[PDB]
Ligand binder design. Structure first.
Ligand SMILES: C=C(C)[C@@H]1CC[C@]2(C(=O)O)CC[C@]3(C)[C@H](CC[C@@H]4[C@@]5(C)CC[C@H](O)C(C)(C)[C@@H]5CC[C@]43C)[C@@H]12
Length: 259
């Protein structure tokens, strides 16, 4: 929109409010409900039930909860200034490469660093809950990532502006209108940095996760998905969500959602 060109301070400050609004309207669960349900945690019997579940059933349940989270990320993008003004090829390029990374950041709200548990299917559970997945190295890496993010003590507004920058990334391979994405990213970084300056919160800039860790977590996920697909190809074909397979398994629901 406007933010495909240079922006004044006043336009930057209103971009802050716009992004913070779009995130408030499109976050799956409210922070207050997540924090308040930390007292209810899975029993040792319930954890065993999850661990004794079959691998392909666990993978399918997790793929559906992941797809649900992606759907709110897509709606977040559609409410972001300039995203719908972009061409549809670039919209799909940004979502295909960022929607998972955004979910990985949003996840720190559902994570409790006090006991290293995460809110999953109604209760809080540690990473042993997912032992039936057979990717304990990836699970551990994601729990560590949420742990380091929780150390930053994000506000909701900070998560809003950070995840906006995760999505609007002009370096994604395949962008057709790169410079126009470059300007949108530039204005969104001013909005982010303006908010941190105003709230005396710039010290977190040097504490943010490095660029290659969100990309590395996403690669590990595609890595483990291909290993699961080789072991259970009909499960993926018959029971995985279409949006999930479009994003992480090559071969169009994004087209529909974007319109
Ligand atoms: C089985 C697969 C499709 C994924 C492959 C391994 C995996 C990965 O993505 O790396 C390991 C992390 C998990 C288990 C994903 C599946 C989605 C979930 C989920 C967002 C679901 C909704 C929940 O409320 C909560 C926010 C707590 C989790 C956080 C943990 C991950 C990201 C799996």
């Amino acid at each position: 929109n406007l933010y495909f060109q240079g922006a004044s301070l006043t336009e930057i400050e209103h971009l802050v409010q716009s992004v913070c609004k779009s995130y408030r309207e499109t976050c799956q669960l409210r922070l207050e409900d997540l924090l308040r349900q930390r007292s209810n945690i899975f029993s040792r019997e319930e954890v065993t039930g999850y661990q004794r579940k079959s691998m392909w059933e666990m993978w399918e349940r997790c793929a559906h909860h992941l797809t649900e989270a992606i759907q709110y990320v897509v709606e977040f993008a559609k409410r972001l200034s300039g995203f719908m003004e972009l061409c549809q090829n670039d919209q799909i390029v940004l979502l295909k490469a960022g929607a998972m990374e955004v979910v990985l950041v949003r996840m720190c709200r559902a994570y409790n660093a006090d006991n290293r548990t995460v809110f999953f299917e109604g209760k809080y559970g540690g990473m042993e809950l997912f032992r039936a997945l057979g990717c304990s190295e990836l699970i551990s890496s994601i729990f560590d990532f949420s742990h380091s993010l929780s150390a930053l003590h994000f506000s909701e507004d900070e998560i809003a502006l950070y995840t906006a920058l995760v999505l609007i990334n002009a370096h994604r391979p395949g962008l057709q209108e790169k410079r126009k994405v470059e300007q949108l990213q530039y204005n969104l970084e001013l909005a982010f940095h303006h908010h941190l300056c105003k709230t005396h919160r710039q010290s977190i800039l040097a504490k943010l996760p490095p660029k290659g860790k969100l990309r590395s977590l996403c690669s590990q996920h595609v890595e483990r998905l291909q290993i699961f697909q080789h072991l259970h190809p009909i499960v993926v074909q018959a029971a995985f969500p279409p949006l999930y397979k479009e994003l992480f398994s090559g071969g169009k629901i994004l087209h529909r959602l974007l319109q």
